[PDB]
Amino acid sequence: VGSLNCIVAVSQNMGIGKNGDLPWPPLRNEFRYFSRMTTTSSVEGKQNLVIMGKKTWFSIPEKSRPLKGRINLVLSRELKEPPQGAHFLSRSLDDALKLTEQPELANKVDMVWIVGGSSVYKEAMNHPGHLKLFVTRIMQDFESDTFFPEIDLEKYKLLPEYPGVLSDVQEEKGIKYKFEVYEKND
Ligand SMILES: NC(=O)C1=CN([C@@H]2O[C@H](COP(=O)(O)OP(=O)(O)OC[C@H]3O[C@@H](n4cnc5c(N)ncnc54)[C@@H](OP(=O)(O)O)[C@@H]3O)[C@@H](O)[C@H]2O)C=CC1
Ligand SMILES: COc1ccc(OCCCCC(=O)O)cc1Cc1cnc(N)nc1N
């Protein structure tokens, strides 16, 4: 199994969601970037795995569920089986990561992408090991009810460049944003 990664878009006030949706209007190319990053695998005959909390799963439009060309794993202690359309269910992040090393998935999974929400990002982020954060900085404040955990910059280094990531300011629907890649290894 390859790299462990988080991917998120976040407003200035650290907001990632409001009432089960994003705090900002749809940003088509920002979404395009999420799709590209999570779907593209380096390794022949492998797919990437996406790991998400239960609420995040149900926040994705039904038509867009499962995330196509990726293996979709949901985290939940309440559910007894994967949601309709989902591929896997685990009871904790450790359990999900262990599973990837099972014979059913060990030779199928390339990158693993944590796509939310708050508590899954937090745990992943505070977990010793090699980890990258793909962070889109939405450069306005948006009213939010769920937030990205604090990025500890003593450990997460902001990379000065990354292949396939544009470095300049983007703008869609009057909203400026920029892409960032952070890396830790501890
Ligand atoms: N802007 C962005 O880039 C992103 C925005 N979002 C948005 O943010 C909101 C984020 O949702 P959020 O409220 O944080 O919820 P989550 O997606 O983390 O879902 C929370 C629920 O997932 C299960 N769960 C979470 N963590 C674990 C775990 N470690 N083990 C087992 N089960 C777990 C549920 O458990 P159980 O069934 O056990 O009660 C828990 O109540 C979403 O509604 C979405 O719109 C999400 C990702 C990215
Ligand atoms: C879980 O977070 C998301 C899941 C889906 C999504 O829509 C993208 C296009 C439709 C699905 C596909 O076919 O890939 C958007 C998000 C939120 C999100 C947005 N942007 C970034 N950079 N990270 C995210 N997690």
Which residues are CB-neighbours of 59 under 8 A, at least 6 positions away?
17, 20, 21
Residues 6+ apart with CB under 8 A from 172: 27, 28, 29, 30
- Residue 10 CB less than 6 A away from ligand 2: no
Atom 10, ligand 2: residue with shortest CA distance: 64
| Domain residue ranges in the chain | 1-186
Q: Which atom of ligand 2 is nearest to the CA of 38?
A: 14
Find the ligand nearest to 181 CA.
2
Helix axes 118-125, 93-100, angle to 10 degrees: 70
Closest C-alpha to 127, from 162, 92, 99: 92
For ligand 2, say whether the CB of 146 is within 6 Å of any of its atoms.
Answer: no
**What's the distance, Cα to Cα, between the start and end of the chain in Å?**
19
What is the whole-number distance in angstroms between the Cα of residue 120 and the centre of ligand 1?
Answer: 7
- Record the tokens describing residue 15, joined without a space: 């907001």
d(CA 182, CA 162): 10
Q: What's the gap in Å between 35 CA and the centre of ligand 2? A: 7
Q: How far is CA 64 from CA 50, 68, 82, 84, 86, in A?
A: 14, 8, 16, 13, 11
The tally of CA atoms less than 13 A away on the side-chain side of residue 60 is 23
Give the separation between CA 132 and CA 58, rounded to whole angstroms.
Answer: 25
Amino acid at 162: Y
| β-strand pairing of 15-17 with 47-53 | unpaired
Alpha-carbon torsion (157, 38, 23, 131), positive or negative: negative
Q: How far apart are CA 146 and CA 168, in angstroms?
A: 27
Beta-carbon contacts of 150 under 8 Å, excluding residues fewer than 6 positions away, are 14
3-state secondary structure of 99: helix
At 25, list the tokens: 């209007």
Please report which ligand is nearest the Cα atom of 137. Answer: 2
Is the domain covering 1-186 a CATH 3.40.50.300 domain? no
Reading the block at residue 83, the tokens are: 């949601």
What resolution in Å is listed for this PDB structure?
2.0
| Minimal-distance CA residue to ligand 2 atom 3 | 115
Best of 60, 93, 120 for a ligand 1 pocket test (most atoms within 8 Å of beta carbon): 120
| Measured distance CA(177)–CA(23) in Å, rounded | 14
Q: Are 132 and 183 in contact (CB under 8 A)?
A: yes
Residue nearest to atom 5 of ligand 2 (CA): 60
CB 43 within 8 A of CB 112: no
- Round to whole Å and give the CA distance between 65 and 60: 6
Cα 76 to ligand 1 centre (Å) = 9
Please list, in sequence order, all residues whose beta carbon lies within 8 angstroms of the beta carbon of residue 122, skipping any fewer than 6 positions away: 149
Mutate which of 11, 115, 134, 175 for ligand 2? The one with the most ligand atoms within 8 Å of its CB, which is 115
